Amino acid sequence: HFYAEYLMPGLQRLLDPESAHRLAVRVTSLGLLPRATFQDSDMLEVKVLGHKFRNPVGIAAGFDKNGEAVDGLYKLGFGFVEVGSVTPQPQEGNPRPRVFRLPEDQAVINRYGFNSHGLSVVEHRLRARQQKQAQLTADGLPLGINLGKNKTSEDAAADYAEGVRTLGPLADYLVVNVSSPNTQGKTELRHLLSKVLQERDALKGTRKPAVLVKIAPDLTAQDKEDIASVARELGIDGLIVTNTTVSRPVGLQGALRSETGGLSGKPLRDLSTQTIREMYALTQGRIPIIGVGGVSSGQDALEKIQAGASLVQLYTALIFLGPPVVVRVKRELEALLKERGFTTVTDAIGADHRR
Ligand SMILES: Cc1cc2nc3c(=O)[nH]c(=O)nc-3n(C[C@H](O)[C@H](O)[C@H](O)COP(=O)(O)O)c2cc1C
Ligand SMILES: Cc1cc(Nc2cc(F)c(C(F)(F)F)c(F)c2)n2nc(C(F)(F)F)nc2n1
Ligand SMILES: O=C(O)c1cc(=O)[nH]c(=O)[nH]1
């Protein structure tokens, strides 16, 4: 409660979004935040992507862009952390201002345009902690790395390749982020993905990261069939559904609603869940999905899980509710699984399809 209508709305008044984000990352890294004490139950454990996840709630890409706060994030209760997106070379991103809060809608619009410290900086930081991560991973706390491309780049495959070569040895999973709204066709995707998988395969007697593709919520019905077709044809390990949306739904109260960019938070929630449900159907329940978009409660997580997600992520909820939201989600999720007749979270995955 202290976070929810004392600290967050107040920070909102005081701090511009970028300043607030930067502060959040630093406070999280430094461990100033009180630690989560909620204990995950066996009921929340998920095994997927070649790893065990102690709980199914992860932090989505975009919070820890540069891998500065990974340990602190696990301490807040996240089951898994995704770093990035990381671009090969450092870049500024778009002109400020570039992130807008719509508190009325519990939503954010962003056009960051991939401000990243770049691969070498993030490699150095992650390497220094690689041993610690190996222990965390073993304890059910995996690490994902999300790869982006520079604004310049004509050659996407080359940018992705630097990323896979550089960070793939540090990753439990890798994500190709082809969905930023702020920076194709089957064949073109197929080529790129094959090149990425080929870079992954070449890795170094690392035993090797799973490769996922992160998609937009704004796709055509054929693209969804296409993406499913490729994933199955290429043996892509997973899908992350979804990134932010370019739409503005009816009823936004926020002044900044007209701003160009990707919308996240509650207004995205149902569109994202719908997108998961299709993808599970098209892929026959055979390809794991990490569901993201507007999760801020246990029910929100459960809906995504029932729709077909094996895991879920959140980011935007933190902006409005603070760190307690991670525990709220897990606590609510456990309570709902018990009420609703599931012995474990795993039993819920794809339940919508079952009926
Ligand atoms: C400010 C901001 C920055 C983001 N940056 C990235 C990014 O760099 N890479 C990425 O894949 N997704 C990024 N995302 C998308 C989130 O990972 C997530 O897909 C989306 O926000 C939906 O989840 P949420 O509603 O819980 O925020 C960003 C989102 C926000 C709000
Ligand atoms: C008020 C506010 C908060 C914030 N994140 C945020 C999120 C947090 F969890 C904290 C902390 F440290 F209290 F737990 C915090 F200090 C800031 N963002 N992050 C954004 C941005 F830019 F990412 F959209 N705007 C924000 N506005
Ligand atoms: O850097 C960004 O602007 C960004 C990337 C992304 O993948 N998603 C998003 O909403 N913003």
Side-chain angles (χ1 to χ4, degrees), residues 173-217:
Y173 71 83
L174 294 168
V175 191
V176 181
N177 177 17
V178 303
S179 36
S180 172
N182 300 319
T183 69
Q184 211 167 279
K186 189 194 238 246
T187 252
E188 304 70 323
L189 187 79
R190 188 199 259 113
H191 212 46
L192 173 79
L193 294 183
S194 217
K195 281 165 123 176
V196 168
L197 293 160
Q198 292 344 301
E199 293 279 352
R200 195 266 317 264
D201 285 343
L203 279 175
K204 346 248 181 200
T206 294
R207 221 93 294 96
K208 298 179 214 200
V211 166
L212 289 89
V213 183
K214 186 165 176 182
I215 68 187

Side-chain angles (χ1 to χ4, degrees), residues 60-62 65 84-85 99 108 110 112 114 146 177 214 242-244 264-265 268 292-295 313-316:
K65 311 267 284 128
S85 297
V99 195
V108 162
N110 87 90
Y112 258 118
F114 280 163
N146 182 311
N177 177 17
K214 186 165 176 182
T242 70
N243 217 308
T244 59
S264 65
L268 175 65
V292 49
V295 174
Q313 304 172 320
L314 64 84
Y315 179 7
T316 297

Side-chain angles (χ1 to χ4, degrees), residues 182-339:
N182 300 319
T183 69
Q184 211 167 279
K186 189 194 238 246
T187 252
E188 304 70 323
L189 187 79
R190 188 199 259 113
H191 212 46
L192 173 79
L193 294 183
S194 217
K195 281 165 123 176
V196 168
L197 293 160
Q198 292 344 301
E199 293 279 352
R200 195 266 317 264
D201 285 343
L203 279 175
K204 346 248 181 200
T206 294
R207 221 93 294 96
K208 298 179 214 200
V211 166
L212 289 89
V213 183
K214 186 165 176 182
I215 68 187
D218 305 324
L219 299 183
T220 276
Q222 71 165 256
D223 327 5
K224 274 107 102 152
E225 299 201 279
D226 284 350
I227 290 167
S229 179
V230 188
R232 282 124 96 51
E233 57 187 82
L234 306 174
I236 279 184
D237 306 294
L239 300 170
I240 302 190
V241 191
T242 70
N243 217 308
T244 59
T245 190
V246 295
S247 64
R248 315 288 92 125
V250 160
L252 300 172
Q253 296 302 292
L256 304 170
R257 73 200 171 254
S258 345
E259 296 283 357
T260 285
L263 181 66
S264 65
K266 203 156 254 183
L268 175 65
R269 179 183 61 197
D270 294 356
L271 173 59
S272 165
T273 295
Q274 285 308 267
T275 310
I276 295 157
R277 207 180 283 105
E278 301 190 46
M279 302 305 304
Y280 190 83
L282 302 178
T283 61
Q284 230 177 303
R286 298 220 87 235
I287 311 200
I289 295 149
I290 299 186
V292 49
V295 174
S296 65
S297 77
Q299 181 180 290
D300 301 341
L302 182 58
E303 287 183 350
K304 283 177 160 61
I305 290 164
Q306 283 171 161
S310 281
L311 306 167
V312 301
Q313 304 172 320
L314 64 84
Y315 179 7
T316 297
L318 290 165
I319 296 164
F320 302 104
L321 307 164
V325 75
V326 186
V327 174
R328 168 212 274 196
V329 175
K330 298 194 293 181
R331 183 170 63 224
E332 287 173 359
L333 176 60
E334 166 172 347
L336 295 167
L337 290 159
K338 301 174 177 232
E339 179 194 34

